[PDB]
RNA sequence: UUUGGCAUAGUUCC
DNA sequence: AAGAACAGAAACAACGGGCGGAACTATGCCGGACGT
DNA sequence: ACGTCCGCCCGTTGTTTCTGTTCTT
């Protein structure tokens, strides 16, 4: 996102990473929102 | 590689989704003694939790 | 050839299918072995019901 | 004299 | 004798967290394809 | 010979609804 912001996107992706930056904090805190990606890693087994 | 590991592993299903498949059958013979071993080869299952 | 299929022991598809107790002390297996099970990674497998 | 973890199954005792 | 805007209280619907205590064995698994 | 990409209970909060007050005509 800093490489993004810095050599000029097209409007969308910065919004897009925005939100991916978002989500990952958001399940790195809690990985059990209601109605979420649930984000894996390897061999289909939820983080913790 | 399918049959292989739903039979080694129980989870009756594909590997990748092995969250909603449903464990317990498959289990590995019991031998502790030949009952043991005829009551183990004629068993039910009821998947109520 | 498109994979091979587990096969349960002592059913029409075993090498052991058939044969008397002779053959079967022969082959180092036990006569009163009942069978319906398969072999998976070495160990015994048990399907349930 | 050095330290694996995740899951599943079975069993013992109230 | 009539009409409007605002506000206080309530019926129903959707959402989320909660669900025993110890202990002992065993078995499978921890990512996949590619060639410059 | 390495390195890149891909099953039941019940506390909250919302939504919606139904009347009361006061001002004006």
Redo the contacts with the bound molecule.
């Keep these: 996102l800093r490489r993004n912001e810095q050599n000029g996107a097209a409007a969308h992706v910065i919004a897009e990473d925005v939100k991916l930056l978002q989500f990952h904090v958001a399940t790195m805190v809690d990985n059990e929102l209601?109605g979420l990606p649930r984000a894996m890693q390897?061999?289909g087994?939820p983080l913790k | 590689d399918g049959l292989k590991?739903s039979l080694?592993?129980?989870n009756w299903g594909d590997?990748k989704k092995a969250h909603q498949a449903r464990?317990?059958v498959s289990?590995?013979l019991?031998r502790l003694t030949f009952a043991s071993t005829l009551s183990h080869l004629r068993r039910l299952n009821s998947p109520?939790? | 050839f498109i994979g091979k299929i587990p096969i349960m022991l002592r059913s029409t598809y075993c090498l052991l299918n058939g044969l008397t107790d002779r053959d079967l002390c022969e082959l180092n297996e036990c006569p009163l072995d009942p069978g319906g099970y398969f072999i998976?990674?070495?160990?015994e497998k048990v399907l349930i019901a």
């Design positions: 209601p390897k061999s087994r | 590991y080694a592993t129980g590997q464990a317990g289990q590995v019991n109520i939790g | 998976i990674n070495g160990s």
